[PDB]
Design a protein around this ligand. Structure first.
Ligand SMILES: COc1cc(-c2cncc(-c3ccc(N4CCNCC4)cc3)c2C)cc(OC)c1OC
Ligand SMILES: COc1cc(-c2cncc(-c3ccc(N4CCNCC4)cc3)c2C)cc(OC)c1OC
Ligand SMILES: COc1cc(-c2cncc(-c3ccc(N4CCNCC4)cc3)c2C)cc(OC)c1OC
Ligand SMILES: [N+]
Length: 288
């Protein structure tokens, strides 16, 4: 039989230190092709090892298609091929649109659903190890046409049944002050919950209430520079214990009032006090 492996690369939709992401076509279907830089080859190996261990399939997890290593003259080429989401990342989407109550809740519940799926160990033969993402942020969430999102980029993920770090802006206090209990898998889940709370804040700002909305801003936009240093973040999050500001106007809206409470419970200094992804999901299903 013929094994069709050609992928037509059509447009570059992202470029960074990690390499590039391309919209491509295989057998008439859109795919996304992440071409890894040499600097980020470990992310391809980690995501490939994870998917070789457990073939994750979930509506709120970016859908895997293939991992490819191709030998070249003096180098190795590494591609990750996934489903393609033409609306782009949540980071991109929130810059050009505001949200109503239903759309806001649908986004955040779908993220919580993908995150709880990663976090939970499932036993039996169609089960999965528990997984922590370790780089959750709005650029690593994609928006689907049906209004739900999916979580992307498991290049830093850890499974439970040289060392790298996530994006500094989204790092939890215990990462920045180096107290994280690196031998406890639950510690990594709690780092994800902190970052989820920041994403919740980014989304909520874009939900209209009483004719008011906030402009899109990244977490800590008002207290750290672009490309904040580790020390910049440590001073804000650990030393001064600052948290993203909740605007007054949210307290006139029942949804945003509830989401503010939820955020706060993701942002406790004590990691063990933070809500779990499953508890976040339940709370979200009862809002509105
Ligand atoms: C090797 O590389 C690539 C292969 C393919 C691909 C293309 N067509 C057919 C297949 C296929 C799938 C299953 C089976 N079997 C199933 C169990 N019983 C026997 C039959 C045979 C063939 C595959 C995998 C696509 C790629 O990209 C998108 C690839 O590159 C990453
Ligand atoms: C890698 O991605 C894609 C692969 C294929 C593809 C091509 N040829 C054969 C297969 C196949 C056929 C039979 C089995 N069997 C498994 C054991 N029990 C019996 C049944 C498995 C796999 C598949 C999935 C199609 C895609 O899209 C349409 C893909 O997505 C882009
Ligand atoms: C975050 O990680 C990954 C994302 C994707 C991915 C999947 N579907 C769509 C996109 C996309 C498409 C268009 C835009 N727009 C940006 C503004 N101007 C117009 C164009 C943004 C994003 C991307 C990036 C693929 C991955 O691997 C293969 C990823 O890595 C695991
Ligand atoms: N790592």
């Amino acid at each position: 039989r013929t094994v069709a492996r050609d992928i037509t690369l059509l447009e570059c939709v992202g470029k960074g230190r990690y390499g590039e992401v391309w919209r491509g076509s295989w057998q008439g279907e859109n795919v996304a092709v992440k071409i890894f830089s040499s600097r980020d080859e470990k992310s391809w190996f980690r995501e490939t090892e994870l998917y070789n261990t457990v073939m994750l399939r979930h509506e709120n997890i970016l859908g895997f298609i293939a991992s490819d290593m191709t030998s070249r003259h003096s180098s190795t080429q590494l591609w990750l091929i996934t489903h393609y989401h033409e609306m782009g990342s949540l980071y991109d989407y929130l810059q050009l649109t505001t949200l109503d109550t239903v759309s806001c809740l649908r986004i955040v519940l779908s993220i919580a659903s993908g995150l709880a799926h990663l976090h939970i160990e499932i036993f039996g033969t169609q089960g999965k190890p528990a997984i922590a993402h370790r780089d959750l942020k709005s650029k690593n969430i994609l928006v689907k046409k049906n209004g739900q999102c999916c979580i992307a980029d498991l290049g830093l993920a850890v499974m439970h049944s040289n060392p790298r770090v996530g994006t500094k802006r989204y790092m939890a206090p215990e990462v920045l002050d180096e107290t994280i209990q690196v031998d406890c898998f639950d510690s990594y889940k709690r780092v994800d919950i902190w970052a989820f709370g920041l994403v919740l804040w980014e989304v909520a700002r874009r939900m209209v209430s009483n004719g008011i909305v906030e402009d899109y801003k990244p977490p800590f936009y008002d207290v750290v520079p672009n490309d904040p240093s580790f020390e910049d973040m440590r001073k804000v999050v650990c030393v001064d214990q600052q948290r993203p500001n909740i605007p007054n106007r949210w307290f006139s809206d029942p949804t945003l009032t509830s989401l503010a409470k939820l955020m706060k419970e993701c942002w406790y200094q004590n990691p063990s006090a933070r809500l779990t992804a499953l508890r976040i999901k339940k709370t979200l299903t009862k809002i509105d």
